[PDB]
Subunit: 140 residues, 3 copies
């Protein structure tokens, strides 16, 4: 998790050099300019170090929130896997059930046709029988 110490800037405990206080007769000129320039530059690098700290810190907070989002996505994916596999099972079951039901209805129609033929035949024979009855009754 993001490290808050990166949010603490360094405050410069030194005071911006006054060019009155440097030793007069002991230093060369070039070295004087060197000390002053080094002071200013120390200030600047301090600033850069602080800003860098803040950049890395923000990178870390972003990484943390993205870690939460990644875990969430992972979980969602896993739930979705359970659901999809269950769905696979139930789909297969439904397809097989449809096919089996189809062979059953096929057999049913097969029986229906024969029943139709039989009922027609019985109808004809019954008609002939009725005619014979009427004929036998016609005489006495």
């Amino acid at each position: 998790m993001a490290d808050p110490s990166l949010n603490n800037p360094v405050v410069i405990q030194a005071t911006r050099l006054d060019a009155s206080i440097l030793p007069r007769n002991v230093f060369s000129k070039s070295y004087l300019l060197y000390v002053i320039a080094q002071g200013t530059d120390v200030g600047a690098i301090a600033g850069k170090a602080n800003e860098a700290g803040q950049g890395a810190y923000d990178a870390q907070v972003k990484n943390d929130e993205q870690d939460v989002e990644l875990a969430d996505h992972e979980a969602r994916i896993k739930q979705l896997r359970i659901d999809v596999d269950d769905h696979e099972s139930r789909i297969t079951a439904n397809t097989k059930a449809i096919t089996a039901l189809n062979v059953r209805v096929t057999t049913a129609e097969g029986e229906i046709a024969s029943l139709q033929t039989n009922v027609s035949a019985l109808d004809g024979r019954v008609t002939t029988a009725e005619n014979n009855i009427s004929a036998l009754q016609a005489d006495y």
Copy 2:
């Protein structure tokens, strides 16, 4: 892409400063105090730069692991997409199959009904015919 150099701190100086090693009849008060706090400040900025660098490094490592996790999530998600599309196909197929089977069962039942009514007709006419036969046989 990860830079290990960000995890390598710069080691400053060699020897620490107390005003012992300082000349100190040559330096004024303000400049003496300036040398010391500046020493302290250089130490502090070294520390801040190092910690910031390390923080950025850790941010990069986290970026790497998150990249791996992102790739994993990508593969898993795309596969789930293909699977879900397959499920869509089979579901549609099953719905259409059910629709096709239902009208089939309907016509089968309609024909069963017609066969029922016809059978009832035959069963009445057959009963009446039996009555006529029995009457013809009775007289006699």
Copy 3:
């Protein structure tokens, strides 16, 4: 969003130290070695701070790209989630339809069976009728 200012290095006006610019008889050995070491090392700290800044920047841009990919993952996951829920619904519906169709077909077959028994009985009765009629003209 990524801050490009982290890629802007501090340029240190001081390029440290020469044996020409330094005072001589005034400094102690330890203090001289301290000045030299301080010169080289402060520069080094500048370099490290700059490098750290660059690292933080790279971390931020990488975070941005990962944000785009994460958003993509979010959208895809939620969409496939609703789709999977839809599949759950229609699968359940299909299972219920299959069960209902099965309940219909069982009863239909039962009715077919009853029809077969009835048509067989009618067949026998019609045969008996044929024999009785045939017998009735047989004796005339």
